[PDB]
């Protein structure tokens, strides 16, 4: 659970040459196409 | 759109909104103008 709601933590990294900013932006773009009632958030290192 | 009563709205606010708002930056006390749904067993004394 994350912030009082059921969650599933996903770890990953940016592919060689690409920054974390671009990798995170794509993950957001992919997260937007997910089924109704499924949100997302950044934690730990990604929150900072 | 007239699909939810104020009891339904009160439950949604209590169950989905209140907890996150109560943990939001700078928020002290949070008061719900309504009540969260419980499983109500309305007993009939004639049938008991």
């Amino acid at each position: 659970r994350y912030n009082g709601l059921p969650s599933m933590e996903i770890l990953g990294q940016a592919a060689p040459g690409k920054s974390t900013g671009e990798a995170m932006e794509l993950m957001e773009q992919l997260a937007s196409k997910l089924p109704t009632g499924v949100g997302y958030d950044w934690t730990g290192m990604s929150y900072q | 759109d007239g699909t939810m009563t104020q009891e339904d709205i009160s439950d949604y606010v209590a169950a989905n909104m209140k907890d996150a708002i109560s943990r939001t930056s700078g928020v002290g006390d949070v008061q719900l103008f309504g009540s969260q749904y419980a499983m109500r067993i309305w007993m009939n004394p004639n049938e008991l």
Side-chain angles (χ1 to χ4, degrees), chain B residues 10-44:
Chain B
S10 289
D11 175 53
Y12 184 84
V13 168
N16 301 260
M17 300 182 68
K18 188 164 179 278
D19 287 352
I21 291 296
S22 72
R23 287 193 285 272
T24 300
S25 177
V27 171
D29 191 44
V30 175
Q31 178 66 47
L32 178 71
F33 299 121
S35 187
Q36 189 177 230
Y37 277 153
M39 182 57 63
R40 300 311 307 240
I41 319 300
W42 303 111
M43 299 180 292
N44 189 334

